[PDB]
Design a protein around this ligand. Sequence first.
Ligand SMILES: N=C1N[C@H]2n3c(c(Br)c4ccccc43)C(=O)N3CCC[C@]23N1
Ligand SMILES: [Mg+2]
Ligand SMILES: [Mg+2]
Ligand SMILES: [Mg+2]
Lengths: 222, 212, 231, 233, 235, 204, 244, 240, 195
Amino acid sequence: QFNPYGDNGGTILGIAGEDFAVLAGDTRNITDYSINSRYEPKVFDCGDNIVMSANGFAADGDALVKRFKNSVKWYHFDHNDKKLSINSAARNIQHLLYGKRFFPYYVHTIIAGLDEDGKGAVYSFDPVGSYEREQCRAGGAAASLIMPFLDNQVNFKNQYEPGTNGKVKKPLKYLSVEEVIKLVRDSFTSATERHIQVGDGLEILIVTKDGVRKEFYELKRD
Amino acid sequence: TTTLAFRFQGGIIVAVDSRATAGNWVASQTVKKVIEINPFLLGTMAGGAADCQFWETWLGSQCRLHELREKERISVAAASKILSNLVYQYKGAGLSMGTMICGYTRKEGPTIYYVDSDGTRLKGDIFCVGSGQTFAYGVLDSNYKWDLSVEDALYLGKRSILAAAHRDAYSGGSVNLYHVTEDGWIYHGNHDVGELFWKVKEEEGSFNNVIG
Amino acid sequence: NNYDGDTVTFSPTGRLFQVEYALEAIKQGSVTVGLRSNTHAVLVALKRNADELSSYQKKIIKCDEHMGLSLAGLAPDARVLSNYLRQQCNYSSLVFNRKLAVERAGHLLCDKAQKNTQSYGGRPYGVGLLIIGYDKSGAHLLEFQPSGNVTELYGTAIGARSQGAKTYLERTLDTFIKIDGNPDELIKAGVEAISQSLRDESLTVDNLSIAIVGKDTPFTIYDGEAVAKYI
Amino acid sequence: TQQPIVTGTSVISMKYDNGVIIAADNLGSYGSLLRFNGVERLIPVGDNTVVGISGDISDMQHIERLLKDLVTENAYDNPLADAEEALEPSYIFEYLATVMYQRRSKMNPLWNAIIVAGVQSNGDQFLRYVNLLGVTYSSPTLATGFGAHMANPLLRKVVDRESDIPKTTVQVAEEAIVNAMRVLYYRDARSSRNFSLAIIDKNTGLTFKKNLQVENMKWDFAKDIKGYGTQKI
Amino acid sequence: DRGVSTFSPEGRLFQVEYSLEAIKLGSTAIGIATKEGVVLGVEKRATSPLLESDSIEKIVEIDRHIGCAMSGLTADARSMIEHARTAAVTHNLYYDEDINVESLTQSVCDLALRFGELMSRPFGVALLIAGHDADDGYQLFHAEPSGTFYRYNAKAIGSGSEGAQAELLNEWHSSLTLKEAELLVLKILKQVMEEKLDENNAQLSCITKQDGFKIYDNEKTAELIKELKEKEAAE
Amino acid sequence: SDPSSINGGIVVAMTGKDCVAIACDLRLGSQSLGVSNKFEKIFHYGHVFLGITGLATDVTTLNEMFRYKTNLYKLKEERAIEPETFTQLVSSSLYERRFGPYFVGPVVAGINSKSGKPFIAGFDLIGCIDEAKDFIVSGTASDQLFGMCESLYEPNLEPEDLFETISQALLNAADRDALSGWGAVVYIIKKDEVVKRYLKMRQD
Amino acid sequence: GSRRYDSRTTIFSPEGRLYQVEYALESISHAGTAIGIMASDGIVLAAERKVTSTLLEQDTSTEKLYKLNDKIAVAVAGLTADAEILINTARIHAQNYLKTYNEDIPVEILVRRLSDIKQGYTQHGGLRPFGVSFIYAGYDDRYGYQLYTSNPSGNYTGWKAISVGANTSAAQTLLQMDYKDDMKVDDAIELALKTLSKTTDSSALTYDRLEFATIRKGANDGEVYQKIFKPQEIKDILVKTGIT
Amino acid sequence: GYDRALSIFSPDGHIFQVEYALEAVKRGTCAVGVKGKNCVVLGCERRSTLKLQDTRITPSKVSKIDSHVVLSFSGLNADSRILIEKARVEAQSHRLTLEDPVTVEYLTRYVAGVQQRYTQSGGVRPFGVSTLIAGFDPRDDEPKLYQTEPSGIYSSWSAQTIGRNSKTVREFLEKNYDRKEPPATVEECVKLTVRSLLEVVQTGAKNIEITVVKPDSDIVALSSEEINQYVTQIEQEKQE
Amino acid sequence: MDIILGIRVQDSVILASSKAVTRGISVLKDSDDKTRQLSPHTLMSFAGEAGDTVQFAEYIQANIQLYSIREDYELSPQAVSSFVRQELAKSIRSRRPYQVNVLIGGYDKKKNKPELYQIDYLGTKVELPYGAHGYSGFYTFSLLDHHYRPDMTTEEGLDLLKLCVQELEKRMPMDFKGVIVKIVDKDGIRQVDDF
Ligand SMILES: N=C1N[C@H]2n3c(c(Br)c4ccccc43)C(=O)N3CCC[C@]23N1
Ligand SMILES: [Mg+2]
Ligand SMILES: [Mg+2]
Ligand SMILES: [Mg+2]
């Protein structure tokens, strides 16, 4: 019997800062126990200061990104070159996903950018289109390894101020872009150690008011 | 998942938890399980997250079209029936929905309809849906009165979700409260279950089984 | 006369009057100019207002990053044909990862217009189009007629009083074709060309509409104070 | 939904400094029966692209006809069909990838794994993969089926990352490809000795080699191997 | 007879040109755009005194940020309004935002030339579409059965249009207040109407960023009519 | 689960000298539960009689369908349909639902008004005609009916003797079937008189 | 194209009349007269066949009176072929109703249905209307004995006595003169035949030029019987009433 | 399918097929509607050119669309049945989906929409019918009276008439109907409705039909004798 | 849903229907009315698959109300039951059948007789002096077979109905939360508010 789905592995991570946002992902592509590519880009600049990644089954992932990029193009044609805001992009992606409710895109989608007040924004989707704005979200193979670490080191969960013994929480102070990138790199380094599908390379797309910048880092290739 | 809604003297209380799971894995603790259909109507999320989100936003669009055409606020009866008739068309295809459509109009007063993906549409005073529904029902049934104050009713809904969050493994995170009046719903905050549990334990004297 | 009731009827001399009447709608339209060098291609269009309270009707439509057109005649027909071009450009990019050649875009517009001239019930399109673009064989300018006839040119003009601009371009042919790597001078030549078609009115800041595409220049439209530099 | 009947095994390929190399054997298997011994599975498109196909042979012949029709169609009303508006490797791949994903989405796939190898107009090397699921990826080396498990490890020792490509000559690359084909003949039960090899170079163009054979084989050591444990004679 | 989609020798569609004549017979509608809002006004024109005039609905809401006034065969407008309302709501569903006034207008105008031998004839009604969005501010559009739409600072349609448009030519400037626009619509409506203008045979409306689209009460308009009378008697 | 034995019931038909007889039980049930003791399974359109066993909803539907069709037949033909012709109509009507059939076992009985010849016929659920000279059986106790009829039947029985034979065939067959019984009706049919008799039987 | 040859069968005149309906009514005015009379104990249907021949097989012939079901019959005036199309549709509708509700179709519901079919041909489709007028004679347990007529416009009305076809003006005046509410079937039989005898364009009214039918509760007890008269039976009733 | 555009514009901007449909309405028997303080009355003309009619079974001029709304008309009788059927189906569809009966305005808006659709759809002609739609909204005691016409325009009326000689009876209503004080009782409203028809009808015998609709689904048709008593009292006051 | 009972006495038809609505684990409601008035003298109770029950009942109600308005006439109970049977017989060979069983209690004003019809989801119709759907008949029919008389008063019918409900409450495993009882007679439909 023909199975229309597959699993290309990969892990992605989106974090929203005060006036910035990052969307990162490893560059390894796999089937079963084989490596297809050590460098296959997974996070894409979609225009209008929006970055996107659809992790899971790569064929569905490529199809969705391609259709969203197309939706941005037609949004410009139909509405006098108006900039597609991140909230509007998120609602649009819901309809793209729910359109195939009974034959779903087998992916976990994350988009990142800035909202209309210039504040950092990350949105997270399930395969059939349910979505939410979030501060922090890992997706894919090693998501279960990364999220607890982020709960602890970004949101300071289970951390209290010394001397008070559980009475006063550690205050939620804002993180810089340099600080966030450190946590992203350590997240993927740790995931590379303990998850076989994670490795080769890490590509990070950073979004600010100035535009979209890229950073690349080597990961272990075993 | 635990969601509830009940009618009382001062309108409707809606209370939900915030947890979403994929198997044993806790996907999110910050899920918005009350869908703001419009400033006067609320819907609750249980079963399929997308099915509830998508079709209740769609419901908001239909309600907006109704009041543009008829120059009058849509009834809770009519709004709930638009949704139930829609999901009935899809029956068999695999939609998953268990929701309370909540509103307060002039002609009806405070009204709640339980709508469900196999086509069920039930009017009622108290409804509770989700994996932790049985726990919340216990607190509701033993403490509910029509003549509850808005303050006490809000607490009752909060306390009932807490009961479910404690015992049901797939319920937790935080509690979202809403109070539905004739002039529209009012949001009454996000309440972390971790902090709420200890606060309630001390002030109420409950949960003596748990060491704090 | 007796042969102009529909598009499915030849006259005794072999003419199609409904098509000729559709051609007449273009002549009533406002003037628009097209010209190109070897590096860039330019559209210049005189926009028309209803009155002093009204806006000036837009004339130029973007089809892709590397292609777009200007219209003269029935504006809704231009919207239909430009939408079709947008789709075809888009099909080429999505399916073949290939930017649609300007010549092939002209062939597609010809065939779409032709079907409306040989069938009962329908009507010809009532608009003329000037398509500019930059593809793998450089800069291009096309002229579309709703008869179906599409022609590749160095320069041209359509609309009311377009003959004046067309004669100017025919004189200047050897000069403006050589304007390579200088967008401003090529637009100047186009603004000077469209000026040969003006009477009573002159080019103002909300009157003028300019578009350009080239080697390292995406199709962009200039309106308002962005064209004051060229007035 | 179907099942593959007559099938072709591995297709292997890699990039080198001035272009790409691709190879595949000439067998059409019918289950374990080695039925057809003269099957060409590398199909050139113009003088800049070679498409290598594994999996179902009936579907391969269909794809072959699609590519033939693509060349005919591109030439229509196209004065620059043999120049600026010729078919690029990237155009040919994207078309195939579209078809493959559409067919899997109708639950009626073309049961193949495909590698498109070529050189672009600007001299850039093109090498990308697509299969029955519509899954696509690129890498300095690419291989299908058994080749993925056995050829890639050998080819990756020559070009391990992007920066190794300019350091790799056509002689070194071809040598590596030919050795990989020998290894596959040793170890793949659905492979043959006869194969085809194609080189697409930005300077010397398309070189298509037919009727190549696996040679320099080691078998002599077999004479000393006796029994399965304790047997001496 | 002859095709419904036939061109004349001058290059105009017969049916479109004829529908424009039907619009000339319609009751007057006026729109004025300012930096404080857009005002829409109409002549009700009841055929008899026994007709309850508040049931005459020639000004209509499309969305909270978009209103619309009509002139001509007003029955034809109902499906156009339905499409406009659906388009406005649908876009909000797809994009979680308000739709641009121009985009809404363009969507309505796409229906216009969908006739032949689709509907059997063009619409016999013209629309003034007024609204506000964040990108282009307060806007007024004139949607015709030809499929063409022009943006206007001020515009009049219907039987008293050319006399009203000449008056709007002189009176409009870029610094008009909302109050000044209200009186100006009332003044020009009073000029071109057959019957004497009052709160029962004329109707006002406006669209502001803060309050959205609002049809004025008869009591509210009656005060503005009294204010108009006094300021005209003031010189 | 098996649609032909959810409701239960039986029909039997026999030929005699210048006469035919058709009989049926009165039970309708939901498997083990007895629901009705007044569910008659024999219908008539003019002088042509039709018994139907099987799924009760289809029994009712087909009666309504053949009443529909024989009424139109009569209006157009200006005469009552004959047993031979009606038999072909039943066959045609059943086969048109070849791949979504009515779960029934119809039985036709009657005398041709012109020739005076007695006629009976049977069908499977899909339209195959069984035109026996002697007898036709149908229903959940068809095996029992075949046994009774084969031994009790003899040709050229007079109307009042045929009544006894067919009655005893039905009664004793029904008493060996859980899903049949709860009353019984016998039609004795001659060229221009038909007598209907309800039989007394055990009610378990 | 094809527009050139379109007669446009469904348009108003400047006066607000439907051309084709009016012209179809003109056609019907040349058809043989049909009369219906309703009494307290039954209904009579009488109709004149159009200029016949001696070689026409009368006993197997039917051009005027048709059975729709056991309770309802119709008299036809106009194109016979058109009438049979509608008659078959009406027969089917009656059976559809009987299957659905397990009750005989009420007379008016059948009449409304056929009349709506006629109406459709005047408003859409671009086809010519049916050149037929019906007189419906029927019985149901709600209103009892009922007479209706319908014409190509699709309009229908109820009657105590009515005529369609040729010389309706003269026929209706004669019926209006002699009809009374307490009238019985045997009296109505006489009135119908006397009216046809005076209005006919033929020299004399004979059995071979007539079709006759009665709907009576003269059926043994609480039921209704339709009687389509045979040629010999029409000959006898002509002698009984003193016309021949 | 037959697609011919029958309703089209003429050079002077008129749609003649719609205008000729109004001429069919002009030919139809007169219909009148009058709303009192707590009721609405619908009066209808019956042409006495047709006697020997069976009045028990003949289609009545006023039709119930629901238990609380009625519809009368002037124009083609066969055309009106199609509109009445559609209106009745929509009324039940509304109850089924909204769980509330139609408002009088909604039902009017639907019927008017159907009429409009038949003026720009291919292969169809407009309805030769104008309607008067009257009743009370659910749980409301305010009287409602609306009018529709072939073009599809509709509006609310304190009192209105349609059909032949409607110009005359509208003349009567315009001078006799006071808005500040409408007919306070059922008697006064029926009297004014009968009076308005007597300007046009001929004999006050079986030529006048009267239907009274009150709040909460209270609809009754007056008999010959009841109407005859109004006819008698009106002329006895007139002899002065 | 669960238990629906019917009994036809001398001058009326009595329908009894359970109040419970259970969604798997919990009883969501204990006051549910499993009936729809089709016409002034005709009542229909129902039980079957969730959603389909109310959808079917309201669909039938709408159709009978439409007929009543069109003809200004109330259909007989027999005619209504035949319409309902055909709809279910049509439904059973559909893509997704209505899984709904019904009882139709009506008073025929023409014949001055009460009438009770039992129809299952297949379109199996029978006219009965008393009837039920599901397992309800298994517990109650032996009592009805014993005590039932055709000349019973309405009060005697209610008493026999109480005995049936008591037996159900004793031997049935499920708690159906009592029954709503409605009477259909010459004066129309009324609910017994204390049972
Ligand atoms: N962070 C979220 N993403 C969605 N989401 C949800 C689940 Br469970 C899940 C599992 C894998 C990937 C995404 C997922 C899920 O339940 N969600 C509800 C709101 C949207 C979502 N939350
Ligand atoms: Mg690792
Ligand atoms: Mg037995
Ligand atoms: Mg037993």
